[model samples]
Target: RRQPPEEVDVLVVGAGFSGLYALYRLRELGRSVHVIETAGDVGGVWYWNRYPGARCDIESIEYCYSFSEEVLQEWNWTERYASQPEILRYINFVADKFDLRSGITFHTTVTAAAFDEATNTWTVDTNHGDRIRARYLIMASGQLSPNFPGLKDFAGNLYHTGNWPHEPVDFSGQRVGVIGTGSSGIQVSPQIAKQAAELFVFQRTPHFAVPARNAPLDPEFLADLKKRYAEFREESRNTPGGTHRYQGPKSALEVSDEELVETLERYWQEGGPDILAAYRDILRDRDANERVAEFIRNKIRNTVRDPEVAERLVPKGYPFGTKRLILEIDYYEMFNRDNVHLVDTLSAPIETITPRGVRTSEREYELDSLVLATTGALFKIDIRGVGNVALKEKWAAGPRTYLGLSTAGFPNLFFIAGPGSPGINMLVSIEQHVEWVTDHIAYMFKNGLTRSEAVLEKEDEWVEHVNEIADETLYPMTASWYRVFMLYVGGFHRYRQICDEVAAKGYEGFVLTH
Candidate 1:
């Protein structure tokens, strides 16, 4: 039905930070590159996730690109943590500055990608029915995609945080019910409470959140940071979570109860996600974790006026840091608002979605607006490698990859920040991955190699190593989005060192052929 597929040296999917950087690097290597984005424009996640009160957990200064010195020096951040609009603007600035739009096809989604072993090329198809052939394919499909529960014909205005509308959504004088107490729900509930006549938050599993204490960026601090940007970025690269914050040398057990309270209280007052690193073994030992969790629970109790509401808000049945540490800005205080309601879904499970509202076992709540604050898994797309092996089936039990980059069956296929990679601050992991993958691609072209794939045995060993490290910690014991142990438990510094060592060893664990 379609004509002969258009050919390119490299084809990249998504226009997120990963995909954009991949395109830039490949072009720098003199390879003909093209990018396809599902959105109408750039700013992948930022472009779509425009929900109320949405902002980055990472600091504004550290969350940006460190690849270009000029860009780093020029762009000034307005807040301690940038909001969705600011981030989207930054993405647009980068795209326009580099004239990246010319190479990117906007408003199109890639449906399938099949590898042809004979030609060592990929046959990529899009929802628009266009086919493309490429010597290399780099998938930068981001970690989050819209996957809401089957709401089943709810007549009310429904919205998913991941795919929020670009225009303004007014909740003025409306009754709003938000599902899920994850980061999105925590962030959006406060904003919705301001406008909604009454706001109800449906919580299945309560999550731990620390104060964000967000503030305007100091001009003097920004200037000082620019002067020391190189050293700052290097320090960030060496950390476990890939942020400037260093893990404390003291263990939670080593410190006395009073000392632990004082130390954690300081971090709590300061705000940000680094509270997880206040003690070295907070995530390693159950007792140590419970101590910290108890402190946070006390804080939440003190914030909300009602004891029952505060207890409902308190996260239990899981380690403090095992689940993702959420950064909250007045989230706990929002519960004090008379208009806000906390619905404990665990106590009263949601039965079904009716025409006008949610029907729970205990009662029915009529809502004019409903927001689904859920997140989807990575590698959700259908990717067929050699012999039509489906990626979904390959990752049925769990995701498998070599260094989280390439799988054995998929030659000339590279993944940036894919499953099994370090799940630290995504900007840090993504930059490292893009640079490494593009460099590897350059190496392949230079050596006249047509195929590059991770050896199956090596992939298995890596997967085992990932789980082994994760098992040493309490990461898998708790049930959360990170329960699969897909990411490296070690610090980003160590991860980067290992990645470098592999490349130095001629990209060990990979089979490169001409």
Candidate 2:
């Protein structure tokens, strides 16, 4: 049904918030562009990832588009943290309002892409084997991609929160086993426990969760926000993480015990990620982080009635906010039910997944269904740059990009929210990236530049800087994906400032070849 053009100025991959926004902006610059999405609809992740209790951690008012004043005012969200279905509806509303779907080929994926040396163009093929040529390639969906061994061996119904089916899955009468206690596992397990005859939650690592306190948006509150919506958005952009703003000035170590409890208790009662910013040194100082972590651990210990179960639920060996913090909707309470069980994998590791269910170091679990709440698996895309060097092969050790936008030897190619970029409320960064890339391409055309690539020196410098800043902070202490020396730990506001400054300075660190 998608009749894509054979030639265009730009080719965008994936049609999520990133890709879809890129399409609209690139077109605003009068560029001939097309987007290909793997899903049959516009919302990339939301279109596919329809798992039970899949809601964003960030507030709906914050985690949205600000590019169009029309969209900002027109769309109204019901809840504080919008569910996947509601988010998708908003995405579709935007797509329809701007006619973005016309440019995107739903149900098609890019099979491979190779850059031409002489022409400074990228040749790409679809899964359907159709070829397209473009002067610039924007990997908008480059950001989010998924890990399970022995998945095929399990004969039970398999489900992954990232790539969930569209149909309403019925596990009402069946026994369900959910693996991983990350964000997805935490949100989905409680929903499954409602109907599943028996629910087994398999957790390798326990994640810290705070009450989302999600409630319907008050009409008066919505009206008030709408009046200063644009101003509210700009203020959020200038701050870190694009969520809320109020960074506490006091150091955790200096704060009195009574003061700390009062401060933390207020945030806990407020019910969000405000705890991370409660003390200035929570993330920066180890002892400070432990202080806050202990407070949270104590709260978790008291929440669940069973001491052993509660202790297992308490996260250890990591600082608060290191990994993606989970906003739970009745997750801990589910453990209180007799039918719900917590299978701690840290102590008793899962050996393998069998046809019956899962086998562990201690015993075997015969599950009727298996759900792997894994975040990142291995990526398997084929992208050849100069000299036909594979993109995957080049960054075998880690991502090598300057500003997380361009990589050396990959001329005329760009990534939206790539590594070296902040992994905060992504919508904030995604909008900036889409606008920045569009601006870069327009500048290239205006100057008659045929290609653009990050210089090796600049790219290496950026990679080092990303790691350097992360080490100075407490982020890299663990092997969390947020650290791993891949992302820029300077903060999202800082990253945005640098990206704009780079663009202002003739796109420095990039070799714009003619």
Candidate 3:
């Protein structure tokens, strides 16, 4: 029943970190911008993912925006690894600081966005029936925005930890089952166990998890970072993965046996995913990485009282850091609790759901509640609502982009931390990316260029480059979403290198301003 919004200079989809910053930059660049988000408020993923044990992997100070010195100096994080609620609070604060909330439309999703060849603008239609026209259609959609399949098959009180209810979930005095043990599973399991009378964990593989080492804010670290904020941000831009910090160049294999043990021990003491950064070639050299992988597996086996349960929990299908590494506090140890039970369904995956709980071929584990921790499908796919722009469908044929910024077929559209780009520290990448995209748009307006898109052949060439570089790296060690299967498996390292190549080539293979 709503009328379409008046024409705007740019329309950003999804108001998460990427979209929010994009709005900020566009407004500062003097372009009229409108932001559309499916959630009622601003936190993007944080807005919906309110499950227990929900926290950020990166330390709070580093995971945020560095664009404004004032913003950095003004806000201070209270902890090292920020919890989801805390992250949401910080996000809300940023929106307030930049006055971005006012520019965003809430409680709606852009159902379909189509290119109008006549006007060369994208007309975005929302599920609520409001339409908005803009010259550029940007999918500020985060990598993990989409949902998993068969989620609705659960017949009981089903919940997805990703899209948690607006109100809190009281698992108190209830029997619960958690499915999938990725980052969400690792974090949520222990928390749920404490609340539920009994908890059944249906796991396929045991993930390598280290203690979070989460602590209150270290004043010294914060003070030093604030003093050199500008330099730190500049440093982030130059890194291959775009993280503000560097994993000093020392291979785990290159060091002597004693030295390697000492170094790995030190990083282990200061746990979490920082293990990947402990050695440079860990992801590049699997044999070297396996040393640390075995170390973690040993830690898991030693900790769990049940040998079979412990063995089932350790990762075997892939190399460490291949899948998204997790951060947790006392997760593996939680299995020691009598109330918590682990069912290794490697041979028998879930068959179906009954009113009581899930059914596996071996047995049916009854529960009062069930939670789905299925992470998002990140590789671009054809989103159901997007008109003719099946990102996933198009990319299913091949993945390509120039500078990881502009793709061939999509004109006047841009993606940040999209498939080809270095998505390590997403906030920093978004800052650099939105600025780059908006700047190019300004150049187009000034130069009298009406539109731009990645030519189809150019898209193909870039995809080929992405695959070629990937073939040489440790990316193919696992079936992670990070790898590409160009008729076969490929590497994330190779995918990352393609972006580096594009950057080094100064945005080569892209036709800008024709």
Cα lDDT of model 3 by residue, 375-472, tens digit: 12324222322245655566664445655676666677787666654556567667767877777677667767767676667666656666766566
TM-score of 2: 0.96
* RMSD of candidate 2 to true structure, Å: 1.8
Q: Give every collision pair in model 2.
A: 146-376, 146-377
- lDDT, candidates in the order shown: 0.86, 0.86, 0.74
- Candidate 2's displacement at residue 322, Å, is 1.4
**TM-score of each predicted structure versus truth:** 0.96, 0.96, 0.89
Q: After superposition on all CA atoms, what RMSD does each candidate show versus the true structure?
A: 2.2, 1.8, 3.8
Q: Report how far off residue 231 is in candidate 1 (Å).
A: 1.9
Tens-digit lDDT track for model 2 on 2-25? 878899999998888999999999
Candidate 2 or 3, higher TM-score? 2
Question: Residue 83: error of model 2 in Å?
Answer: 0.4
Lowest summed lDDT window (length 10), candidate 3: 485-494
Model 3, position 422: C-alpha lDDT score: 54
